[PDB]
Design a protein around this motif. Sequence first.
Motif, PDB file in Angstrom:
ATOM      1  N   UNK A   6       0.838  -1.164   0.018  1.00 58.84           N
ATOM      2  CA  UNK A   6      -0.161   0.123  -0.003  1.00 58.84           C
ATOM      3  C   UNK A   6       0.925   1.380   0.056  1.00 58.84           C
ATOM      4  N   UNK A   7       0.415   2.042  -0.771  1.00 60.60           N
ATOM      5  CA  UNK A   7       1.300   3.490  -0.930  1.00 60.60           C
ATOM      6  C   UNK A   7       1.246   4.402   0.192  1.00 60.60           C
ATOM      7  N   UNK A  14       6.527   1.514   1.796  1.00 60.65           N
ATOM      8  CA  UNK A  14       5.235   0.864   1.612  1.00 60.65           C
ATOM      9  C   UNK A  14       4.917   0.186   2.867  1.00 60.65           C
ATOM     10  N   UNK A  15       3.434   0.131   3.005  1.00 64.69           N
ATOM     11  CA  UNK A  15       2.787  -0.829   4.029  1.00 64.69           C
ATOM     12  C   UNK A  15       2.498  -2.016   3.307  1.00 64.69           C
ATOM     13  N   UNK A 101       6.231  10.149   7.839  1.00 63.86           N
ATOM     14  CA  UNK A 101       5.055   9.420   7.734  1.00 63.86           C
ATOM     15  C   UNK A 101       5.030   8.616   9.022  1.00 63.86           C
ATOM     16  N   UNK A 102       3.851   8.448   9.631  1.00 57.95           N
ATOM     17  CA  UNK A 102       3.713   7.462  10.991  1.00 57.95           C
ATOM     18  C   UNK A 102       2.358   6.619  10.954  1.00 57.95           C
ATOM     19  N   UNK A 110      -1.289  -6.916  12.244  1.00 61.35           N
ATOM     20  CA  UNK A 110      -0.191  -7.666  11.431  1.00 61.35           C
ATOM     21  C   UNK A 110       0.222  -6.964  10.253  1.00 61.35           C
ATOM     22  N   UNK A 111       0.350  -5.506  10.315  1.00 59.81           N
ATOM     23  CA  UNK A 111       0.932  -4.702   9.251  1.00 59.81           C
ATOM     24  C   UNK A 111       2.407  -4.770   9.582  1.00 59.81           C
ATOM     25  N   UNK A 112       2.863  -4.886   8.109  1.00 59.19           N
ATOM     26  CA  UNK A 112       4.325  -4.474   8.114  1.00 59.19           C
ATOM     27  C   UNK A 112       4.637  -3.138   7.556  1.00 59.19           C
ATOM     28  N   UNK A 113       5.806  -2.404   7.755  1.00 55.26           N
ATOM     29  CA  UNK A 113       6.309  -1.333   7.219  1.00 55.26           C
ATOM     30  C   UNK A 113       7.504  -1.324   6.723  1.00 55.26           C
ATOM     31  N   UNK A 114       7.717  -0.933   5.243  1.00 59.03           N
ATOM     32  CA  UNK A 114       8.749  -1.047   4.643  1.00 59.03           C
ATOM     33  C   UNK A 114       9.571   0.363   4.541  1.00 59.03           C
ATOM     34  N   UNK A 115      10.611   0.584   5.245  1.00 60.41           N
ATOM     35  CA  UNK A 115      11.409   1.906   5.150  1.00 60.41           C
ATOM     36  C   UNK A 115      12.863   1.831   4.445  1.00 60.41           C
ATOM     37  N   UNK A 116      12.926   2.344   3.246  1.00 62.36           N
ATOM     38  CA  UNK A 116      13.887   2.209   2.445  1.00 62.36           C
ATOM     39  C   UNK A 116      15.238   2.526   2.964  1.00 62.36           C
TER      40      UNK A 116
END
Lengths: 183, 183
Positions: A6-7, A14-15, A101-102, A110-116
Amino acid sequence: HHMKLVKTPLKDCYIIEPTVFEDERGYFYEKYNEKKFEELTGLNGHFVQDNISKSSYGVLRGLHLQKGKHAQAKLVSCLEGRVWDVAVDLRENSETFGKCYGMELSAENKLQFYVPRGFAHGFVVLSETAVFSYKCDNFYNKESEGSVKFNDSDLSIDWKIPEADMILSEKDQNAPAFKDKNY
Amino acid sequence: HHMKLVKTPLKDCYIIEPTVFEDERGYFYEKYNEKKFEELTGLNGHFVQDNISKSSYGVLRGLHLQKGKHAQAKLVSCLEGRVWDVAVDLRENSETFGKCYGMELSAENKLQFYVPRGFAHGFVVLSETAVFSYKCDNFYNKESEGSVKFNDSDLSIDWKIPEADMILSEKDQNAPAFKDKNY
Ligand SMILES: [Ca+2]
């Protein structure tokens, strides 16, 4: 079967929303798949290190990064409890440089957060305690560490809980301002 | 800092014992490090898929594997609750071919269990519910699936809980015997 990324307002950040299959005994889901992720993003999906921490309500860690060739992309989630997780784009060439962004990560959602790579990252514990998981696409290197003061007035991040409740390490209390470019 | 891999009676099958740092707010540890793992084992440490399941007391899944070039090494742990996890070496050339090993994985003990390619794997839930995590070093392939009947009399695996409490899928209830070589 398709991975659902998810954008967010930050470029390349991304989420990952899981597709959960339920049944009599419980549930199952594919949490992460490198091939699917790389197909969707054109980014590196090879994670090499997994880290776990457990902390109590109000513990706030960040904003942290590793500089240069030691920079770590992070795939983060919450295995128990609830946290508020924040990313800041620090790529000077990025159209979202300097933006933040928070989002809430929880065992329930169960979400994951992708941090480049090139971002700074931090989180605050919202529940009584929380177990935080972060996978990194590069190895630890102490000398390379950079940081941004979590409550920097230029970023004006909303850390959600009352300021009197926040628990910060001495290092995070003294991290340099965003404009000082410790990254 | 060193990764701690503890030998089991099955060749190439290891327990990862974490080095847990405790502090005022909680704890932290490095759960996994690909470089350290490959240095210690000479095996592939690049995991490509992470899977999660949650199941109720007595649910027993196994014994499962993927055949040939689709075989998956599995790095498994229990994120919530308690499970009893079993591995069986099915490599015909291995000095431990046909031998099994079982151990408790729990949120409390934070252990991980490395199950090489060429093994079958399964687990049973010991607590009211349990959340099970497994990372695979190869991708899902339905056609390649093999299986061994969990209560095969040649293997005589001790699954710890009463047989009357076990809940098995139809597929696992009908898996071929070890001597039928569905692997
Ligand atoms: Ca790759």
